[PDB]
């Protein structure tokens, strides 16, 4: 079970010039393309090994389609500045995420297309891929245009057609990478916070994909009281890192146990403090 | 592959 997602981001810099558009694309937790309006290149660019192999026709198509998008987005910044009657002093920010989801059988599960302005829902396409949800009045106008232009019929044709055809090609092409499970390599650390309390941190490193569940147990029983989780973070090599901590009474370290569930673990893992 | 650019703006 896997996904493709594009993330477009377009920022106004009134005076400093034309908007900065930046597009990136993902298959599961792995980036594979990018476009930056300010780059020398002026091309959609590879960012995984397994896409480099697409031919010049692919790169040209992807380049032009995405330039065409950056251009719409550029106009859209001024149309929305006009909807909200904001002055042309301020930097504003359209962001679009869309993509699809296939099951292990390789068939369509869901599609997505969601736009926002200044960091807040603007307009979304519903799971019906046939109707939109405006968040405010500006979006309600967009919504009439897109109802008449039949925009939804366009997204749907993409998300149920070319999005999955190509997600599937990318998973075959990248199978040694995109379908690897890398299990988490786990240690535990101990930080006396006081003469009475101490912090057990449970570490998980080098794992892919990023989906992972770290829980604590005391004397063999669910424990969430006094527990932290960090935001899962990237290693830079295409793998993930995340820790979980609990504050415990000193002397009582040996009753707590870190539990680790990840896709590439046949059995869940288990750590205990060892001094 | 990216979606085609929309036929109308916002």
């Amino acid at each position, epitope marked *: 079970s896997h996904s493709m997602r594009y993330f477009y981001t377009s920022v106004s810099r009134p005076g400093r010039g034309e908007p900065r558009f930046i597009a990136v694309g993902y298959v599961d937790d792995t980036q594979f393309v990018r476009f930056d309006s300010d780059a020398a290149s002026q091309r959609m660019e590879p960012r995984a090994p397994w896409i480099e192999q697409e031919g010049p026709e692919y790169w040209d198509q992807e380049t*032009r389609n995405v*330039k065409a998008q950056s*251009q*719409t987005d550029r106009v859209d910044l001024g149309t929305l500045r006009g909807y909200y009657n904001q002055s042309e002093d301020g930097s504003h920010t359209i962001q679009i995420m869309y993509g699809c989801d296939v099951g292990p059988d390789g068939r369509f599960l869901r599609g997505y297309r969601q736009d926002a302005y200044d960091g807040k829902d603007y307009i979304a396409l519903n799971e019906d891929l046939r109707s939109w949800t405006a968040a405010d009045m500006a979006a309600q106008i967009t919504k009439r245009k897109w109802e008449a232009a039949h925009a939804a019929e366009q997204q749907r044709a993409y998300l149920e057609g070319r999005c999955v055809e190509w997600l599937r090609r990318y998973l075959e092409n990248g199978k040694e990478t995109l379908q690897r499970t890398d299990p988490p390599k786990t240690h535990m650390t101990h930080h006396p916070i006081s003469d009475h309390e101490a912090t057990l941190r449970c570490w998980a490193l080098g794992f892919y994909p990023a989906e992972i569940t770290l829980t604590w147990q005391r004397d063999g029983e669910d424990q969430t009281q006094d527990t932290e989780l960090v935001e899962t973070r990237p290693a830079g090599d295409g793998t993930f890192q995340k820790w979980a901590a609990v504050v415990v009474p000193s002397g009582e370290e040996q009753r707590y146990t870190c539990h680790v569930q990840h896709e590439g673990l046949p059995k869940p893992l288990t750590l205990r403090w060892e001094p | 592959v990216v979606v085609g650019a929309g036929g109308v703006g916002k």
Partner: T-cell receptor
Amino acid sequence: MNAGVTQTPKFRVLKTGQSMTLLCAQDMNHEYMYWYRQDPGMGLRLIHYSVGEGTTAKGEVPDGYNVSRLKKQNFLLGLESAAPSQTSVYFCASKVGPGQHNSPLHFGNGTRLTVTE
Amino acid sequence: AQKVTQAQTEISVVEKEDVTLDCVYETRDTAYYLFWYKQPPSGELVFLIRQPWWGEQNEISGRYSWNFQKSTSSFNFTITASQVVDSAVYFCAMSVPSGDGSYQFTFGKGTKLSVIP
């Protein structure tokens, strides 16, 4: 509500080597504008075009023609040196731009030019 | 590799009768719009319809119907109850994103329809 695309002149006859400017204005705030010729058996050939004020680009049959997009409003076609080859029907055209990628071309009515020895 | 082909130069049908105007496109681009234009004796060029790549097959619009077949790259125009008025030159066309992202056009060479009393 809107005039659309206006072209001047409508008829004109040069002598070979004389010069002239066909003028085209559009009142619809379009970003792209175009200059086509139209000949028996060839249909519609683009001469030059412009995606924006200040900029212009060579089309399919530029040689013999210059253009200026000084203002968004108008797009000028200049014949510096009239050839009989350029005897034709010239058609100005505009298109909204990236606010509406699906926009069709809007054409004017056409200038009928005859260049003679 | 953008061509549009109309293939019929010239077609003639008696009034109160169906006529279909064949049009075939060739592109490798996936985000195209196809168009039809009408050019009566007067010369001016009138937008009729746009079918986009993602579109449904049929599109009715008064006496005018069109039939989009992506598998075989044909976009044929039918007229029911042909009236001499319909006599004209009819132009199939197509737009794709160009280098800078701006949509730009490729025209067939035209079919000449004579509807005779």
